[PDB]
Amino acid sequence: QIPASEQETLVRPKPLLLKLLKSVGAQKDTYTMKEVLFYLGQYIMTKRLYDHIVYCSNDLLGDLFGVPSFSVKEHRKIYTMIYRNLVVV
Numbered sequence: 001q002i003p004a005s006e007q008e009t010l011v012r013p014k015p016l017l018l019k020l021l022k023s024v025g026a027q028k029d030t031y032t033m034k035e036v037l038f039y040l041g042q043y044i045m046t047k048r049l050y051d052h053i054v055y056c057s058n059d060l061l062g063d064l065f066g067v068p069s070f071s072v073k074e075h076r077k078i079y080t081m082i083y084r085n086l087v088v089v
């Protein structure tokens with residue numbers, strides 16, 4: 001029960017989120033939430049942090065989100081953790 005519109009939001013990552021995104025995607029100043037979620041998704045799968053829990057205490061992603069692990073099924077929490085690392089444009 002998250003709206004579809006949320007993936008349209010325009011955002012400006014803070015430096016550490018930007019560092020992580022640069023490892024998987026082109027470097028722009030502005031991203032859609034859709035893009036951010038995809039890049040983070042690819043980052044996680046590429047680095048195999050996920051086998052419904054993502055484990056990230058041995059990874060920069062852990063520092064980014066402030067948790068050692070999280071559930072992929074809890075989307076509102078994920079959006080919340082993402083939002084602390086960006087500015088809405």
Ligand SMILES: CC[C@@H](CS(=O)(=O)C(C)(C)C)N1C(=O)[C@H](CC(=O)O)O[C@H](c2cccc(Cl)c2)[C@H]1c1ccc(Cl)cc1
Nearest residue numbers: 037038040041042044045050054072073074075076078079
């Ligand atoms: C790395 C985990 C990826 C995998 S996936 O969708 O890309 C695929 C099934 C294609 C392999 N992921 C999920 O597995 C879960 C699947 C689900 O529980 O519905 O969806 C995650 C998702 C999608 C959209 C928004 C949010 Cl906040 C999270 C989504 C996700 C979780 C965390 C982050 Cl940071 C980004 C995307």
